[PDB]
Amino acid sequence: TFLRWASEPEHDHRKRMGLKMLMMMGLLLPLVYAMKRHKWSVLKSRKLAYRP
Amino acid sequence: LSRFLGPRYRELARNWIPTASMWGAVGAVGLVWATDWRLILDWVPYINGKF
Amino acid sequence: AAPTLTARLYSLLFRRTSTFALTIAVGALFFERAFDQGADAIYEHINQGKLWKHIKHKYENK
Amino acid sequence: AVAASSKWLEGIRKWYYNAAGFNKLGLMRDDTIYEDDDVKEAIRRLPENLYNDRVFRIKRALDLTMRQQILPKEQWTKYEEDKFYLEPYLKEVIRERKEREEWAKK
Amino acid sequence: IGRSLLTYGRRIPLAEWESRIAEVDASVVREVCSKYFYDQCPAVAGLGPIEQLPDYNRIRSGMFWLRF
Numbered sequence: 001t002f003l004r005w006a007s008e009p010e011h012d013h014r015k016r017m018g019l020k021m022l023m024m025m026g027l028l029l030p031l032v033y034a035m036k037r038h039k040w041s042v043l044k045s046r047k048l049a050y051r052p
Numbered sequence: 053l054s055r056f057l058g059p060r061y062r063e064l065a066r067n068w069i070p071t072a073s074m075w076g077a078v079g080a081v082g083l084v085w086a087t088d089w090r091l092i093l094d095w096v097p098y099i100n101g102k103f
Numbered sequence: 104a105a106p107t108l109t110a111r112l113y114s115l116l117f118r119r120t121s122t123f124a125l126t127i128a129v130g131a132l133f134f135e136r137a138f139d140q141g142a143d144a145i146y147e148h149i150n151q152g153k154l155w156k157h158i159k160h161k162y163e164n165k
Numbered sequence: 166a167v168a169a170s171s172k173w174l175e176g177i178r179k180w181y182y183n184a185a186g187f188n189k190l191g192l193m194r195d196d197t198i199y200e201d202d203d204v205k206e207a208i209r210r211l212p213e214n215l216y217n218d219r220v221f222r223i224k225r226a227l228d229l230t231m232r233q234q235i236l237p238k239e240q241w242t243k244y245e246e247d248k249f250y251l252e253p254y255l256k257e258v259i260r261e262r263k264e265r266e267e268w269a270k271k
Numbered sequence: 272i273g274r275s276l277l278t279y280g281r282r283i284p285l286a287e288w289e290s291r292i293a294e295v296d297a298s299v300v301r302e303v304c305s306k307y308f309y310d311q312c313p314a315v316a317g318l319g320p321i322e323q324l325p326d327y328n329r330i331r332s333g334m335f336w337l338r339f
Contacts, residue, residue: 012154020142042327044232050221071338074121098132118310120339 188242189235190226195251207255310335
């Protein structure tokens with residue numbers, strides 16, 4: 001347990017930013033989706049008839 | 053000068069001093085965050101972004 | 104037809120374009136206030152009695 | 166070569182027309198040709214009651230795929246009423262290039 | 272006289288119209304224009320040749336400034 005820590009001491013400072021990355025991202029990203037849908041929701045509602 | 057003298061340019065000035073004032077306020081406050089400006093970061097103790 | 108929170112919110116602070124941009128500013132003040140604690144408490148509770156702050160009480164201030 | 170067994174071969178001709186799915190989207194065969202410069206001139210020779218049909222078929226059968234459905238099964242273009250309305254206007258542009266070419270050569 | 276009586280009554284002499292035109296001001300125009308125009312959804316109709324007509328997104332987003 002001593003030796004591995006000597007070989008790579010950034011273990012303990014890594015798994016904490018790796019945790020304050022998921023919580024923050026995991027709620028902003030579900031926002032962008034909604035703004036998307038708005039914009040693309042102009043074009044999925046059109047009917048297109050033909051009269052020669 | 054004389055091309056710009058009148059009441060209408062002074063009226064646009066007093067109409068858009070909201071624009072200039074908000075523009076300057078946002079710019080000044082942003083210039084605090086951008087350069088890690090601690091000297092105004094402390095004027096409000098609510099942003100404890102310095103670790 | 105009782106109005107929802109959205110109608111009164113849009114009457115209050117969203118249809119100005121000089122108000123709207125601000126309250127975006129607001130969340131980070133609130134988020135900054137409420138997020139360090141929310142993450143630190145859970146991380147520290149996950150693994151207790153295992154980091155120096157839980158062991159320093161043997162040797163601290165004599 | 167063979168004739169009696171060609172009735173077998175006709176069968177596989179029905180198979181491939183069902184495998185490729187240009188009938189499912191409401192098209193005919195000649196709507197799906199790659200337009201190089203010999204097919205850019207035999208399209209400008211169409212009568213204007215056949216040119217407009219090809220425009221409406223393509224614009225409807227291209228917005229289905231950004232919506233990702235297909236069209237009702239009674240509506241599929243049936244196999245035998247498909248029309249080759251562009252073979253005759255194209256086996257003349259090719260036949261006249263070849264000619265400018267034997268000229269220059271020989 | 273026929274419509275002005277089939278839609279209110281009371282034919283409304285010229286003097287009564289005139290007294291409603293002595294009380295319009297710059298602020299009044301500002302308020303009503305803001306109420307009926309600013310950030311609303313319009314209706315649009317067009318008859319050919321119409322291919323430079325901008326889309327509904329880019330027409331809707333012209334219905335409010337961003338500075339004010």
